[PDB]
């Protein structure tokens, strides 16, 4: 229920939006501006989505990919 995403979705966080690159039963990769890869995002992902950061962090032209694991 909490760890549920669909590829292509946009999610509001803080004063930005991150996008779902890939989502599976146990993993999710988001696209977000790198400066947001800090505690507030981690708390949001953990508390709202049962998701915890595992990496790696991959650089793209307008943001980074961050991969998270389901922690139910």
């Amino acid at each position: 229920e909490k760890f549920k995403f669909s590829k292509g979705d946009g999610i509001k966080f803080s004063n930005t939006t991150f996008h779902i690159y890939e989502a599976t039963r146990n993993y999710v990769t988001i696209h977000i501006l790198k400066k947001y890869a800090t505690a507030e995002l981690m708390e949001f992902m953990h508390t709202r989505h049962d998701a915890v950061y595992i990496g790696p962090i991959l650089e793209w032209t307008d943001g980074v990919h961050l991969t998270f694991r389901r922690k139910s």
Copy 2:
């Protein structure tokens, strides 16, 4: 069968690519793959098919990256 089982040199088909086994031990494995594939779909494949979870580090090479995983069960 033990799912966390790999052989150095093997190629494994994943998505539209093939990754290769660099090193494999009882509890760890390092694969070689294009960096763009170091995302959720690969993690799911490794977790579900091989009881393997990502620990890093991520090492750059001329034709891909090394990624190291640990056995989870």
Copy 3:
């Protein structure tokens, strides 16, 4: 007392330096510190004094790095 407790903006003395709190939530904290200190002595300090363990990522800034930690207990 709850050991995993921090206030944005605070400086904390560690070794021969001072690190600063960038963000702090119930379960996560991001500190700003010189990169050379992202090693075992800092990890021990954070673990033992603050119930905090390193998760990353490590972000580069002009005068140091951001490091993110998770609450362990």
Copy 4:
């Protein structure tokens, strides 16, 4: 007993030697050539020293720092 190191020690691994930069009750930072930051080293640290990799990985002129946590 297994997770026990002293700052400055040199440890033989494979065809190289790594050095202990720092060691505490629960953490150790080693200095090693980057190409060895792969499964064989992880198995050695895990099995011989009850140590598991947490990072970060820091670049120096002749190798990298890698930080590990005690996993007893």
